[PDB]
Amino acid sequence: SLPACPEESPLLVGPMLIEFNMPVDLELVAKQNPNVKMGGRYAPRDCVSPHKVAIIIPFRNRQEHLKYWLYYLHPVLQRQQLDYGIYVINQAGDTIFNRAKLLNVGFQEALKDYDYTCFVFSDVDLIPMNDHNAYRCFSQPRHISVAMDKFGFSLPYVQYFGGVSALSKQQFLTINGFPNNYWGWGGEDDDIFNRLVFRGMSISRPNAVVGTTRHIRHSRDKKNEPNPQRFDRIAHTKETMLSDGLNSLTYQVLDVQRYPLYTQITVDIGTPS
Numbered sequence: 001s002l003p004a005c006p007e008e009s010p011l012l013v014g015p016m017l018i019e020f021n022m023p024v025d026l027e028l029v030a031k032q033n034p035n036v037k038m039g040g041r042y043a044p045r046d047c048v049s050p051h052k053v054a055i056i057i058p059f060r061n062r063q064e065h066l067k068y069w070l071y072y073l074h075p076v077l078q079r080q081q082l083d084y085g086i087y088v089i090n091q092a093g094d095t096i097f098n099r100a101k102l103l104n105v106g107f108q109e110a111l112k113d114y115d116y117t118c119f120v121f122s123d124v125d126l127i128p129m130n131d132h133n134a135y136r137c138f139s140q141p142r143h144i145s146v147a148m149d150k151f152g153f154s155l156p157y158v159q160y161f162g163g164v165s166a167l168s169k170q171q172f173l174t175i176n177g178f179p180n181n182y183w184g185w186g187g188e189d190d191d192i193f194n195r196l197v198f199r200g201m202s203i204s205r206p207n208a209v210v211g212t213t214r215h216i217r218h219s220r221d222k223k224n225e226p227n228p229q230r231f232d233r234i235a236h237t238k239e240t241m242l243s244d245g246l247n248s249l250t251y252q253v254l255d256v257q258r259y260p261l262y263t264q265i266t267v268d269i270g271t272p273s
């Protein structure tokens with residue numbers, strides 16, 4: 001009987017103040033966000049959202065950033081009137097990090113929970129400064145974190161597609177998902193950009209003011225060193241995407257934790273083959 005939510009949420013307040021210098025207590029954040037259900041799920045109670053969104057976070061040893069992420073995003077996602085769920089894909093073990101393979105795991109595993117039709121892929125340390133920056137999907141792949149403080153509030157280059165993005169289920173399937181062999185830092189987001197272009201799509205973005213985003217300043221994590229093969233890998237995306245991605249993926253889930261504000265999937269994604 002519920003009518004459809006309006007096209008744009010009337011609850012949005014625009015520009016918000018973001019700070020990362022205070023402690024965060026997730027028990028309290030949960031109290032502040034009473035309508036968020038076990039596992040970090042929420043749907044509005046007064047209308048039906050056409051946006052069934054799984055928010056995927058690549059993760060390992062960033063609990064503090066995550067706390068900030070949950071404190072700021074949860075209120076924003078409810079104001080955006082989304083039918084959403086949060087998934088932190090925690091990489092088991094201590095070997096070289098693989099951001100994009102975790103993202104692929106996230107897509108596959110969240111689909112087992114619910115009929116999601118949109119996927120937001122977000123680094124754990126990026127917080128939006130304006131709730132008008134929609135964390136849902138569009139008719140074309142959506143780049144969300146378009147104006148980051150660390151890049152001077154502008155794109156570092158015009159084809160930059162890293163940070164936070166949103167792909168509908170169909171867009172993600174059309175590019176065979178993300179590459180599984182970008183181990184260590186860099187390039188996997190450029191590869192993904194290439195995949196979208198090679199499948200006839202173009203990047204949708206909000207304007208630079210609405211797209212303003214804060215990056216929690218942090219130092220280098222061990223086990224995610226710049227991948228030296230990244231420039232050669234992005235040069236062959238058209239050929240490699242055909243057989244590297246969803247259709248060449250395996251992983252072993254070790255544990256699934258339903259916390260009040262998010263579901264954490266700990267997974268073994270292995271090492272280079």
Ligand SMILES: CC(=O)N[C@H]1[C@H](O[C@H]2[C@@H](O)[C@@H](CO)O[C@@H](OCc3ccc4ccccc4c3)[C@@H]2O)O[C@H](CO)[C@@H](O)[C@@H]1O
Nearest residue numbers: 156157158159160162163185186187188189190230231234
């Ligand atoms: C592959 C890679 O390392 N990508 C990461 C990206 O790296 C940037 C950065 O190094 C920058 C400053 O030196 O230069 C970029 O390259 C310039 C450029 C971009 C795209 C082109 C496409 C066709 C022809 C010529 C081009 C020139 C380089 O890609 O930095 C991002 C932000 O830190 C990372 O997310 C990304 O993984």
Ligand SMILES: NCCCCCCOP(=O)(O)OP(=O)(O)OC[C@H]1O[C@@H](n2ccc(=O)[nH]c2=O)[C@H](O)[C@@H]1O
Nearest residue numbers: 058059060062097099123124125218219220221224
């Ligand atoms: N001068 C300090 C510069 C330090 C450069 C470190 C690289 O910085 P960025 O380009 O922001 O990449 P990154 O923050 O390491 O993370 C990319 C994303 O991977 C995730 N990530 C990466 C590495 C790691 O050990 N754990 C983790 O969770 C996380 O969601 C993160 O936001």
Ligand SMILES: [Mn+2]
Nearest residue numbers: 123125215218
């Ligand atoms: Mn970062």
